[PDB]
Design a binder for this molecule. Sequence first.
Ligand code: GDP
Length: 261
Amino acid sequence: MQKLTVGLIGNPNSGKTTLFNQLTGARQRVGNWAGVTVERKEGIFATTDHQVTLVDLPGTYSLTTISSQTSLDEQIACHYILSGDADMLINVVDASNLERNLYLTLQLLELGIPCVVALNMLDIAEKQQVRIDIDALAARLGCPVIPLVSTRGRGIEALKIALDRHQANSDLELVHYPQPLLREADLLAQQMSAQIPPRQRRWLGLQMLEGDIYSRAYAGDAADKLDIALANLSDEIDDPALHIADARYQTIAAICDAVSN
Ligand SMILES: Nc1nc2c(ncn2[C@@H]2O[C@H](COP(=O)(O)OP(=O)(O)O)[C@@H](O)[C@H]2O)c(=O)[nH]1
């Protein structure tokens, strides 16, 4: 029995609290994110091989801020995910709004954090005549995808086995970004703290290029973005932030269509 730290993440209203309580029962403590007002719930449970600490993370639709005035809430889950204190994540997805929920899902697989998706609200999706091919969705995301109805407590056991068994998401060419954006995101990548693993480094350069406000603080060379963007003014010219998003959205668009009836 190894101790294992899992983060619980999701868009707001994906049924994350329900799930938190199904997993931890009465064994949960209420605290706050360090130096701040936002509440940090955390609790515990045991699968066949791990004694897990589950750390609830604030709802967010996206990790990336292109923006100024988002929130403190939405801005903290990035920070935690990137710190490494979590060994794997549970991604709570509202099956009834897949395409919209998968933006966040897809940023996490791009970060590379081991990840199991809790496809929650399978009953709401049926009531809307939405059928989803789970096996197919897992084959496209590269990570387990486990069916849930948190209200009833359906799937909690399979969600746990999944966590016992999953180690590493499948290594996938998920989003096709245009080459110049990549070339700069690696330029930006390769001049950053070596503790930060290579995928995450890359991901952050993409984020920097895209406009992310609070990403500049992990880089150690944002002294250096202004020139990345200029070297691009020729190439995938007008708008890096457009083509960056577009590529993720087409990815998620294609997935959703492969797999929803
Ligand atoms: N019908 C249905 N409702 C759910 C399911 N999961 C959570 N809910 C309900 O969805 C609403 C959102 O729940 P909550 O856990 O607070 O969402 P959170 O903000 O994302 O934590 C609540 O009324 C829950 O009772 C589910 O699988 N099916």
